[model samples]
Target: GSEPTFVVNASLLPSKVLGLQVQRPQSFNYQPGDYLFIKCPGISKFEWHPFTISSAPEMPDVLTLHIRAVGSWTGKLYQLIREQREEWIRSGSSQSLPGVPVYIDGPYGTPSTHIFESKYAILICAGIGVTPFASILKSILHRNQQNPAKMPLKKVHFYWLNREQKAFEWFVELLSKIEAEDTNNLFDLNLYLTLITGLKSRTKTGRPDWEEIFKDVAKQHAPDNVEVFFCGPTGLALQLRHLCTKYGFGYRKENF
Candidate 1:
């Protein structure tokens, strides 16, 4: 009950997703892939919703989260945020959009915090599951820009799958920016647009052939040196787990 109240800067991202930005706490320390519980008083005073911290620690000014309006609670949050923004815009004030009051708890640990433990990392994400990896990929890019030789992880393979073409719209700009700044070829981005999204990278269609992916990865990197971090449906997680065992690759997942 004593947590400090943080002001939220909310915006609507593509695909009905909500983007929440809060001033980073000076003393709060967290790694990429960690998540926090957020409680917006305008929506619910008592119910706290957990969302992955979607911004990198490299940007020390703000902590960001991406939330999908998939449920009653989330939908309500989005609606309230929208109305708040609309009111501000109507007033035509010179001041910034009025901040929504929110409280945060537990930038807790997850399997993804260990991303740099191995030489190679493969991030398999689906739908809005790209949230956590957004932080990680951004952090990697920042660190690489600062000093590529100091980064422990040598290579990253990201695979994002979506059922609809519009789902890829949310992160296209970021991915494209990453593509542009990635001079050393540190990231292997594979979007299963399964879009005509603006990413210069090839937009793959259909579903990813897990067998072939695992086989090819195994043939390239040493099994013991590679790790797979996945965030998505349980069924796909199951398939990835089985393949990890067969290929001797380390496996980690985010459980809701």
Candidate 2:
């Protein structure tokens, strides 16, 4: 593991997420599916947390982490980061960036590291678990932009499951930005809004139809050649495993 430590360059609360982009250390290098072990002393001096790197390896400068406030520590950290952005609103400075001390470790963990090794990649994300795929997806898009003809990837698919509409709010632009490039004919992206009311059923208002989803997945690639990458909550991973197995697509579980 590398000692990739740097200051928090920016902290933002776009909606329900507490997003931070830490300055990339001089020595930092990471695979697309790698993660960061984070320690924010201001939140908890002894307790450290793990976050998947949401920034691409190809991207220069700072790296980003998309965090949701779900616990005591996260809530405290959320407040702290939001306070910094709010500080900008009060302070005359154009930007009142947070100076809260943060310690970072690792460009660690993988086998999922080599997502490109698989010709077809299907990234299934549940809620915030979409974190790990953030970089890999962009990596695919950028690499395709540079050399669409030379790319080894036959297909790249992203399926994000969200129960509420608000869950999709923080990342609307990212999802849109990626989708807008579909004209390039490089990748396919789908979103399952399982619980947003007033939406008609293409799948459900609750759960995704795995059988229906994989029926096409089966058609898209050779059973042995396809690789399914997933990061999400417990049951969903199990669900993904079972479905991929049903279709005979290769699958990998990744940390976020």
On lDDT, the candidate that comes out on top is 1
lDDT of 2 by residue, 1-256 (tens): 4243545555454446777778888678887878888888777878878888888888887888888888898888888777766667788576545466678888777656567766777878878888787778777777777876666777777777887666666566666666667675556666676723222213235576778878787886754477877777767777778887788887665432
Alpha-carbon runs more than 4 Å astray in model 2: 1-11, 94-98, 195-205, 253-256
Worst 10 residues of 1 by lDDT: 1-10
| Pairs that collide, model 2 | 194-205
Flag clash pairs in model 1.
none
Candidate 2: Cα lDDT at 133: 79
Q: Which ten residues in a row have the lowest lDDT in candidate 2?
A: 195-204
Taking the tens digit of each residue's C-alpha lDDT, what string does model 1 give over 4-114? 655557768777888888887777788999888988887878898889998888888789888899988999988888887888888877785667778889778788878
- Which candidate should be chosen as best, given TM-score against the real structure? 1
Candidate 1 stretches greater than 4 Å from native: 253-256
